[PDB]
Design a protein around this motif. Structure first.
Motif, PDB file in Angstrom:
ATOM      1  N   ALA A  70      -1.912   2.630  -5.743  1.00 42.73           N
ATOM      2  CA  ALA A  70      -1.830   1.922  -7.013  1.00 42.73           C
ATOM      3  C   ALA A  70      -0.438   2.016  -7.617  1.00 42.73           C
ATOM      4  O   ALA A  70       0.097   1.010  -8.099  1.00 42.73           O
ATOM      5  CB  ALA A  70      -2.864   2.478  -7.993  1.00 42.73           C
ATOM      6  N   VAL A 106     -11.828 -11.838   0.529  1.00 41.89           N
ATOM      7  CA  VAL A 106     -10.697 -11.593  -0.358  1.00 41.89           C
ATOM      8  C   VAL A 106     -10.133 -12.922  -0.837  1.00 41.89           C
ATOM      9  O   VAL A 106     -10.145 -13.923  -0.112  1.00 41.89           O
ATOM     10  CB  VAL A 106      -9.610 -10.754   0.345  1.00 41.89           C
ATOM     11  CG1 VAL A 106      -8.559 -10.290  -0.656  1.00 41.89           C
ATOM     12  CG2 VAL A 106     -10.252  -9.574   1.054  1.00 41.89           C
ATOM     13  N   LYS A 144      -1.093   8.983  -4.828  1.00 41.96           N
ATOM     14  CA  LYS A 144      -1.497  10.229  -5.469  1.00 41.96           C
ATOM     15  C   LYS A 144      -0.690  11.418  -4.967  1.00 41.96           C
ATOM     16  O   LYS A 144      -0.402  12.337  -5.742  1.00 41.96           O
ATOM     17  CB  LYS A 144      -2.993  10.465  -5.256  1.00 41.96           C
ATOM     18  CG  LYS A 144      -3.888   9.290  -5.657  1.00 41.96           C
ATOM     19  CD  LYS A 144      -3.651   8.832  -7.092  1.00 41.96           C
ATOM     20  CE  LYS A 144      -4.650   7.771  -7.510  1.00 41.96           C
ATOM     21  NZ  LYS A 144      -4.489   6.518  -6.727  1.00 41.96           N
ATOM     22  N   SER A 193      -7.605  -4.774  -6.789  1.00 38.73           N
ATOM     23  CA  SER A 193      -6.913  -5.912  -6.200  1.00 38.73           C
ATOM     24  C   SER A 193      -7.332  -6.177  -4.759  1.00 38.73           C
ATOM     25  O   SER A 193      -6.679  -6.968  -4.072  1.00 38.73           O
ATOM     26  CB  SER A 193      -5.405  -5.691  -6.272  1.00 38.73           C
ATOM     27  OG  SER A 193      -4.992  -5.505  -7.613  1.00 38.73           O
TER      28      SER A 193
HETATM   29  N1  LIG Z   1     -10.592 -10.507  -4.152  1.00 38.98           N
HETATM   30  C1  LIG Z   1     -11.671  -9.742  -4.324  1.00 38.98           C
HETATM   31  N2  LIG Z   1     -12.879 -10.237  -3.968  1.00 38.98           N
HETATM   32  C2  LIG Z   1     -13.962  -9.475  -4.138  1.00 38.98           C
HETATM   33  N3  LIG Z   1     -14.046  -8.236  -4.630  1.00 38.98           N
HETATM   34  C3  LIG Z   1     -12.838  -7.772  -4.974  1.00 38.98           C
HETATM   35  C4  LIG Z   1     -11.631  -8.440  -4.858  1.00 38.98           C
HETATM   36  N4  LIG Z   1     -10.586  -7.650  -5.312  1.00 38.98           N
HETATM   37  C5  LIG Z   1     -11.177  -6.540  -5.686  1.00 38.98           C
HETATM   38  N5  LIG Z   1     -12.536  -6.546  -5.512  1.00 38.98           N
HETATM   39  C6  LIG Z   1     -13.467  -5.467  -5.828  1.00 38.98           C
HETATM   40  O1  LIG Z   1     -12.716  -4.316  -6.165  1.00 38.98           O
HETATM   41  C7  LIG Z   1     -13.247  -3.155  -5.490  1.00 38.98           C
HETATM   42  C8  LIG Z   1     -12.255  -2.678  -4.461  1.00 38.98           C
HETATM   43  O2  LIG Z   1     -10.949  -2.625  -5.060  1.00 38.98           O
HETATM   44  P1  LIG Z   1      -9.671  -2.442  -4.154  1.00 38.98           P
HETATM   45  O3  LIG Z   1      -8.559  -3.208  -4.758  1.00 38.98           O
HETATM   46  O4  LIG Z   1      -9.971  -2.794  -2.694  1.00 38.98           O
HETATM   47  O5  LIG Z   1      -9.371  -0.891  -4.175  1.00 38.98           O
HETATM   48  P2  LIG Z   1      -8.808  -0.244  -5.499  1.00 38.98           P
HETATM   49  O6  LIG Z   1      -9.734  -0.487  -6.627  1.00 38.98           O
HETATM   50  O7  LIG Z   1      -7.427  -0.865  -5.721  1.00 38.98           O
HETATM   51  O8  LIG Z   1      -8.564   1.303  -5.282  1.00 38.98           O
HETATM   52  P3  LIG Z   1      -7.568   2.051  -6.215  1.00 38.98           P
HETATM   53  O9  LIG Z   1      -6.112   1.638  -5.851  1.00 38.98           O
HETATM   54  O10 LIG Z   1      -7.730   3.588  -6.030  1.00 38.98           O
HETATM   55  S1  LIG Z   1      -7.931   1.568  -8.066  1.00 38.98           S
HETATM   56  C9  LIG Z   1     -14.596  -3.587  -4.927  1.00 38.98           C
HETATM   57  O11 LIG Z   1     -15.642  -3.356  -5.864  1.00 38.98           O
HETATM   58  C10 LIG Z   1     -14.386  -5.079  -4.669  1.00 38.98           C
HETATM   59  O12 LIG Z   1     -15.606  -5.808  -4.726  1.00 38.98           O
END
Ligand SMILES: Nc1ncnc2c1ncn2[C@@H]1O[C@H](COP(=O)(O)OP(=O)(O)OP(O)(O)=S)[C@@H](O)[C@H]1O
Ligand SMILES: Nc1ncnc2c1ncn2[C@@H]1O[C@H](COP(=O)(O)OP(=O)(O)OP(O)(O)=S)[C@@H](O)[C@H]1O
Lengths: 343, 105, 11, 352, 141, 105, 126, 133
Positions: free
Chosen positions: D188, D16, D126, D61
């Motif tokens: 989100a 991250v 949600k 994120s």
């Molecule tokens: N800092 C980061 N480094 C690497 N990959 C990241 C990073 N931030 C997001 N991603 C990518 O984003 C996806 C995961 O997103 P998350 O933020 O963990 O979950 P999310 O997309 O927020 O779920 P939601 O709230 O339902 S949209 C994966 O495909 C990760 O590889």
């Protein structure tokens, strides 16, 4: 036997600020104990805001009490025949505490928490039916008035020898909790004549209008009827107990007066690591203001402490040669960091 | 005392451990049964003894009573041990029967 | 089976 | 001994980026949880409560990524859940108790291990209520789920079947306490920025005194999300008791061009490395350029979908190349240039 | 599968997990085969939310389906029922991961061209300074 | 699974419900049998499983284990279900003989 | 018998309870009087549908009751009792009974010097 | 039955199928007896063309009058997916539709009677001879 003085005094340590609620609780227990030795009954209802200590009072009452006591939730309760639990299961939990003694259970007390969740609501055309509303309130009402209800025969072994214990809930005392949301708005219509455009018409600003605590004190059964509760349900309960929002002084006391004070919790967390912690009276005052602004009860206090010691606790174990920690009012304001005492 | 209830327990638990769905056979012709006549055929009704099929299952020597849905409506069914004829797992050919009891007559 | 395979139901 | 938060932060930082605030809260909470587990009583004459964490951040994120990465470094039981699937008791939807069953399975059905564990609940936004006032109609997957979770977070015994419900009539349901089980919520909260804008920004009317932001100086969602209080969530729609159970709230800033560029190669499971391995197993080599990553970041940021946007750009750029690459032969290495991303040039090919 | 019939969990409509049950039938109830299977979805445009409709009214057909497919698409453990007819909480269900399963969504979005034209062209205006665009000059759908 | 352990527990409790003395018949020739050989005769032995004469009685599916007193020295008994031939009451011989099973060879 | 308890829609349960008090006497059972309570609670799952089922008891229908056996023996033990002679009564205290009646009773509103008007709260006893 | 209570599908829940259910309850869920039953409707008025149900409620009755199979619960219970619904043919069930119409007489008067309505010399309903209506 024990007078309400020691009941309220001992209970004062854990809970501070509520005056009327404590008297009602102690009086009910005192009357229950006297009646137990030898008429009728009176159920209690606790209507207070979030973080007012409703659940805390029940937990403390169990320790002081010397008879069977159990805490249950109304969300799990469902109408008979469904996968969810039934009202009879509450009695079963009570029996578990008293070694499944039918005689002891009859003289035991039962407290239900989160009662405002169940209430008559819309048909919900998309769903098949509503099993957590009026369906669970009618059966529960039957238990309040006092009626024999079939329960598993103590579940001691596979075969209890056809016991089929049925416990009369007439003697048992029922106390209802719950933190009703929006009830203050309903009471506003009855206690507020309204506002008008004319000069003579009285208009109240956001500050001038009474807070939810004041309106809750003036609550009547009629308000609860249209709120989503059966009229006979509230009628069965003849005692109404209401709490009030805490104040800065009350919050300050809660931080260090009780034996399980929030400040003491973090102090022990630091003490076991070989570090000392200190607090200032001015810091507690600022914390009370921020916590009160959040409008979340005593729970808001924790949100402030964790936010202040976030960076500190993150780097504290990594560093060494730390003897004590001092926190000032500036730290709460976010304009400085806690002072450390080395050596 | 009659051997029908004690035997029922052994066969009931035995089938459960085997992972089979145990089923019970009731003789509606004998008195004391409480079952709908419309479903019962050939003077006998097969009542599922599995825990999921019924509710608040309790087995006693004097009588056994269960809560089950017949036609989609909740109902209470209580049958004496004398009416019980045999217990077998309907999913497979495995099955057992209860020997005649003299006290029941 | 006159009785339903599942006594408990879900809405 | 117990690892320090700095060590934990380093492990999460590997996967991250740009989430220092979130990593600090998670590390501190995990550090405190380990100490509570080390000491059974946890104090001489006091009881230490648990501070449930909340993770409010934009899409893509790294909210779910943090939970997945944390599970690898953790030792105590860990489990993820979906709030949408959860429903109040007595309905077809999955029950709240099923969450503990998943965690219970991870520890080989050990009640003691389950008593002290970490739980992650995704998609918490949600199930948020539509309005602050109580819903006139029953919400099986909305307010009902929140009300049911109130007792679980606070701490209460739960009934779980050891192996199967039908194995026995009652099963002597395992009693597991949840007063010492940490819970981490993630959501989100789309549209929440509007609430803080209405409260923080005022005087938007038509008038000389009233000021207009001009949609250029308006605070971004990332910085605006930092300013948040429980009253804001109430307007968005959430039970106030639920907020009281979550005392610590963390905010995740929106990814920037520099942050995205690092994600292309710095993390372990990077988008570039994924395609490189895909081409490597086929018998081809791949190369990237710094200028190409910069252009991809700009286009990805314009999509307004987080890190997921990166996969969209790269996939569209290598669509034609990947289609005709296996048909060709004698190719050993491929090179991607900035012009290729723009679409005005084709990727260069290297023949052995 | 058809997205129209889909409904979020806890309602009379079939749950999203039912889709996995259909895939299992094709692979003879093989968990490993299902994990490497492909899934196609149609009528995805129908589940699109209504911006005009206020959020006060809950949408299960359009909004609930989208929210439920997030974890399933991204990859999550799904308690697929053995047959898919009903999903009782007490009942036992098979666990199938969707971390590697591929999903394909399709749908003829009606009115999408109008939104794109408004944003891409932005040629409206009656004033002298504002440009005038002929109907023929408009790009095709 | 074998029916013997389920039928044993059922018949065992019955004799206690009628104020009888449950007695077991064990085959000392099966491997794994841990019983007093001096008290066995003609390849068989009789063991009293009444609560008044036995402590820590465990009727499991794999084997029967319990503590008892033999003469002036306490001894521990362990008998597999395959070695249990029958159960009869000392007061009137009431009981039944366990039938063979495929699992037991 | 509470209306809400029987709103789901048994009648035989009430009849056997009445018979048990008189020791399963057909003559005494007929003289017995039945009273329904909480009828207002069901007034606007069957709702009005269960009322039709109850109407059958009003007209008079035979009911089979076991003589303390507690099990079903239609061949020999069941005793037949008619409900025609039995009197059925009910008490209703539904909300807003006076306002609904006032809609059809008062029926008066006017704006004039001589027009009839009444107090805002009320002018006639409940 | 009361037509006003009925509602279109997707609404609060009242449906035309419930009408047949009431008939079956009268005959003890006897499909053969139900076919010979005489169905009656009351208060047909108050439901008509001006979304709201309105005329839509009547549309459901179309197939019922002409005759069609109707799904009804097995024993007059709430609709459950884990059960089957019996089919009753309404092709032999006589329907009697009754209702009180308010204002229909005024419409008929304009069509058949020759009067100037609100007029100095126009006839008025002051004679109190309601029999004419
Ligand atoms: N800092 C980061 N480094 C690497 N990959 C990241 C990073 N931030 C997001 N991603 C990518 O984003 C996806 C995961 O997103 P998350 O933020 O963990 O979950 P999310 O997309 O927020 O779920 P939601 O709230 O339902 S949209 C994966 O495909 C990760 O590889
Ligand atoms: N009067 C009080 N004195 C000390 N601590 C208190 C008091 N009231 C609340 N608390 C703290 O608040 C937490 C308990 O929350 P409760 O007040 O019991 O919640 P509640 O008021 O019952 O509302 P619910 O349960 O969410 S509906 C503990 O951390 C207590 O220390």
């Amino acid at each position: 036997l024990p007078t309400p003085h020691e009941i309220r005094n001992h209970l004062d340590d854990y809970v501070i600020g509520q005056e009327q609620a404590k008297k009602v609780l102690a009086v009910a227990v005192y009357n229950h104990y006297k009646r137990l030795r030898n008429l009728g009954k009176s159920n209690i209802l606790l209507i207070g805001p979030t973080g007012s200590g409703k659940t805390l009072l029940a937990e403390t009452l169990a320790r002081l009490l010397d008879v069977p006591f159990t805490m249950a939730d109304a969300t799990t309760l469902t109408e008979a025949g469904y996968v969810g639990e039934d009202v009879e299961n509450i009695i079963q939990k009570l029996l578990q505490k008293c070694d499944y003694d039918v005689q002891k259970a009859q003289r035991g007390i039962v407290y239900i928490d989160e009662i405002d969740k169940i209430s008559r609501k819309s048909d919900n055309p998309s769903i098949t039916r509503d099993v957590s509303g009026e369906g669970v309130q009618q059966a529960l009402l039957k238990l309040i008035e006092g009626t024999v209800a079939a329960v598993p025969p103590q579940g001691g072994r596979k075969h209890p020898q056809q016991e089929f214990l049925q416990v009369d809930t007439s003697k048992i005392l029922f106390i209802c909790g719950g933190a009703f949301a929006g009830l203050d708005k309903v009471i506003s219509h009855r206690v507020e004549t309204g506002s008008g455009i004319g000069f003579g018409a009285t208009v109240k600003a956001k500050s001038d209008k009474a807070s939810e605590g004041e309106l809750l004190a003036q609550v009547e059964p009629e308000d609860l009827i249209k709120f989503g509760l059966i009229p006979e349900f509230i009628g069965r309960l003849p005692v109404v107990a209401t709490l009030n929002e805490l104040s800065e002084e009350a919050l300050i006391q809660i931080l260090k007066e009780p034996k399980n004070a929030l400040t003491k919790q973090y102090q022990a967390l630091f003490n076991l690591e070989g570090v000392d912690l200190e607090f200032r009276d001015e810091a507690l005052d600022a914390i009370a203001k921020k916590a009160m602004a959040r409008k979340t009860g005593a729970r808001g206090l924790r949100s402030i402490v964790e936010a202040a010691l976030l960076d500190t606790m993150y780097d504290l174990p990594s560093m060494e040669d730390v003897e004590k920690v001092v926190i000032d009012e500036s730290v709460i304001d976010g304009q400085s960091e806690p002072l450390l005492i080395y050596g | 005392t009659p051997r029908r209830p004690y035997l029922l327990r052994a066969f009931y638990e035995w089938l459960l451990d085997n992972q089979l769905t145990p089923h019970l056979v009731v003789d509606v012709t004998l008195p004391g049964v409480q079952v709908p006549m419309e479903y019962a055929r050939d003077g006998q009704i097969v009542l599922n003894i599995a825990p999921r099929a019924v509710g608040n299952l309790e087995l006693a020597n004097d009588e056994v009573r269960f809560n089950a849905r017949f036609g989609g409506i909740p109902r209470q069914v209580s049958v004496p041990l004398a009416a019980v004829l045999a217990i077998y797992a309907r999913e497979n050919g495995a099955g057992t029967m209860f020997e005649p009891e003299a006290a029941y007559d | 089976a006159a009785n339903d395979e599942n006594y408990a139901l879900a809405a």
